[model samples]
Target: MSPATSPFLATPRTAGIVGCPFSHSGPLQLIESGLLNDIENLGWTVDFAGADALKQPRLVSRVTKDVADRVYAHASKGQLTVTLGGDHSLAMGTVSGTFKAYPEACLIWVDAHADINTPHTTESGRLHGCPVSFLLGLDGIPEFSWIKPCLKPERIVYIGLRDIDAGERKILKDNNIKCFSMFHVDKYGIGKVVEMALDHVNPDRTRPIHLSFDVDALDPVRGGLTFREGHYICEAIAETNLLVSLDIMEINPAQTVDVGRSLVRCALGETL
Candidate 1:
């Protein structure tokens, strides 16, 4: 295994599992599927900070507040924070928490949708779709005042984006945020796409990386990353040795049990 970048960790390396599920039995499904065992077997010293529901604005704020606190606790200690599925909104906390610990970190968001809609631009009014706006500290709503807008647009990059709102698109362009869409993956291949992505966000490779990965980015049914391509993304990031925090979000348990488990293992350095 590659040596850890963190001086706080001992030989085995510690992985702090943050199981924060906001929908279905997403987190539990992963844990029950032997995710922790997979992590332990991979030689990580596991520290689990267990498992969440909600769409209410106030509720979203409350839960995300809790998630931020939980994630921060681990990240501050230099543990590899592994957050399980909850809708993508949990990123408000994960990103915030990680940035709290390592303010210089860059974010690599992998998702089919940008999820950057602002409260004003969101048609569905879904908080999950609007986490990025809050993280970027845009159009602050008092309900989510706890969010500190820690993410700078330039410090983040996106891959696997296929379905993004027109407003979100404009925001991305205006902010000059770097995104490598499915077309880029199709044309340049996943390896090149990841390399270009890392180049954009962490060219010097000195910054820590917080990977907020939404499984829909794989888009299995609609020409998304094939299983192999998806695994390669995880594998590639693990090889960087700069990954400090991970958020595995939006895993529809009924359809994604096994692949989801495997992806986590791959991210934690499991090889084929």
Candidate 2:
């Protein structure tokens, strides 16, 4: 709890970088191996970072708790926190910590899976698929009390959904969260989807933006401090000016090195 030991970090150009190499859900461990180098190559300044954390029957929960504290610390300092990672589950911290820093911010989740499953409803029982629920405070355990619910149900939006669990669909519906699936994107187009996304969650554009980008879906952004949204994070900067923090997660280097690189570039405003 001392400032020296607190998890916050500062970076160059009003930003901070943190790496989470959590691979428990799948084979995304290699994401941290080369991805951070690529990000730094884009000229981002990292205050503190790693592809690293665990516990007594609590490795996942314990490490994630630390991740949240660190990321939150950075955000608290007004740095645009950027998290590099291998697991979507880490969003439980990245997003939670972001919300802690900017409680009024809206969230944009770009990925294929619904990723909103509650602990009780998860079939695969993968923690990655359940971070959204935790962020919403729909589910919690003692290991994560350090994270309070910083997001309201209506404060977030989802795009690029395809594969979804049955229970996840129900959760989205029950909570009335604004979600735009791939079907909606294919129908309305990426521009319209992004427009609707901001209209729904971040309409006033007054609140800071917490972008939890799961590159497995898409990335988009354009001008004025770009951030990803489908078309791979282009439409965001093309649309909004306030980007506070970003988490690029679940990228398996072996399966998605190019895809991962592209997303990171878009997030950090790289030309490539």
Whose TM-score is greatest here?
Answer: 1
Q: At residue 44, what lDDT does model 1 achieve?
A: 90
**Local distance difference test, per candidate?**
0.82, 0.66
Collision count for each candidate, in order = 0, 16
Q: Positional deviation of 75 in candidate 1, in angstroms? A: 0.5
lDDT per residue, candidate 2, 7-28, as tens digits?
A: 2224454456777667732223
Model 2 scores a C-alpha lDDT of 0.66
Could you give candidate 1's per-residue lDDT for residues 31-136 as a string of tens digits? 8888888899988988884432223787888888988998999888878888886688899899999999989999999888888888888878778788889888
Regions of candidate 1 where Cα sits further than 4 Å from its true position: 1-12, 49-55, 165-167
How far does residue 129 in candidate 1 sit from its true spot (Å)? 1.1
Q: What is the C-alpha local distance difference test score of candidate 1?
A: 0.82
Indicate the worst ten consecutive residues by lDDT in candidate 2.
1-10
